[PDB]
Swiss-Prot record, chains A, B:
This is 5'-AMP-activated protein kinase subunit gamma. One of its GO terms (cellular component) is cytoplasm. The 4 CBS domains mediate binding to nucleotides. Of the 4 potential nucleotide-binding sites, 2 are occupied, designated as sites 2 and 3 based on the CBS modules that provide the acidic residue for coordination with the 2'- and 3'-hydroxyl groups of the ribose of AMP. Site 3 can bind either AMP, ADP or ATP (AMP, ADP or ATP 2). Site 2 binds specifically ADP (ADP 1) and is likely to be responsible for protection of a conserved threonine in the activation loop of the alpha catalytic subunit through conformational changes induced by binding of ADP. ATP binds at residues 15, 20, 41-42, 119-122. GO terms for molecular function: AMP binding; ATP binding; identical protein binding; protein kinase binding; protein kinase regulator activity; protein serine/threonine kinase activator activity. It is found in: Nucleus; Cytoplasm. ADP 2 binds at residues 15, 41-42, 119-122. Disruption phenotype: Leads to a decrease in the length of G1 with respect to the wild-type strain along with a smaller difference in the cell cycle length of parent and daughter cells. The chain holds residues 181 to 320 of 322 of the full protein. Adenine nucleotides-binding subunit gamma of AMP-activated protein kinase (AMPK), an energy sensor protein kinase that plays a key role in regulating cellular energy metabolism. In response to reduction of intracellular ATP levels, AMPK activates energy-producing pathways and inhibits energy-consuming processes: inhibits protein, carbohydrate and lipid biosynthesis, as well as cell growth and proliferation. AMPK acts via direct phosphorylation of metabolic enzymes, and by longer-term effects via phosphorylation of transcription regulators. Present with 11700 molecules/cell in log phase SD medium. AMP binds at residues 15, 20, 41-42, 119-122. The gene is SNF4. It comes from Saccharomyces cerevisiae (strain ATCC 204508 / S288c). Keywords: ATP-binding, Carbohydrate metabolism, CBS domain, Cytoplasm, Nucleotide-binding, Nucleus, Repeat, Transcription, Transcription regulation. AMPK is a heterotrimer of an alpha catalytic subunit (SNF1), a beta (SIP1, SIP2 or GAL83) and a gamma non-catalytic subunits (SNF4). Note=Interaction between SNF1 and SNF4 is inhibited by high levels of glucose.
């Protein structure tokens, strides 16, 4: 159980790989392309300075189409009705991932800028290692 | 909107590919290997006759470890506190996928045997096609 009480910053489990970050001006069509090509279920939305300001889910794309393309992420978000740091412990993140039913948490730095991602897949692979 | 009102059985969107089905006697460790190697977030549990009887989620693995390995899926399930047919319309499945927050629905035949899977990824790719 001890291995769950270690800050993720002490592990090699965070990736900077395929975060597919978007801006509020990104066309939704581009977001869907990133979700499919990236094989990811959400994209972090950042501002010009790299601060994480929101997240757009594959679920939102479905909702968008059911709810009435070229429109911006910012626009799509208005029609709609998370995060960790390297100091967070794996046990906490595991609990929050399950409660939120998300497949990735975005890792932010001290001032809230996006710096990486921790995926449910990598958590499983880490469990499998031992 | 019309394209959402078509039974998925009329489409080419269901796959029989990577369903990673397990039985109640499958070791949980084998299930985690299937989740990671398969890049899937759940596995269908079937009986000896191919009937779908349950589903084990990657979330359950995390829960299992947080909640106190070689144990069977059946056993793991006891510690824990979905499906469609080819006649279901895409609009209905889209709604249920979002409400359930799952990344795949298992497709069953007339008598409830597992016959395929419809993934959130393939739904997105289908939207992108048009």
């Amino acid at each position: 159980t001890h291995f769950l009480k270690i800050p993720i910053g002490d592990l090699n489990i965070i990736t900077q790989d395929n975060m597919k970050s978007c801006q509020m001006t990104t066309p939704v069509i581009d977001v869907i392309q990133m979700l499919t090509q990236g094989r990811v279920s959400s994209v972090p939305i950042i501002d010009e300075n790299g601060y994480l300001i929101n997240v757009y889910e594959a679920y939102d794309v479905l909702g968008l189409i059911k709810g009435g393309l070229s429109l911006s992420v910012g626009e799509a978000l208005m029609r709609r009705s998370y995060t960790c740091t390297k100091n967070d412990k794996l046990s906490t993140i595991m609990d929050n991932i399950r409660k939120a039913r998300v497949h990735r948490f975005f890792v932010v730095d001290d001032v809230g800028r996006l710096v990486g991602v921790l995926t449910l897949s990598d958590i499983l692979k880490y469990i499998l290692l031992g």
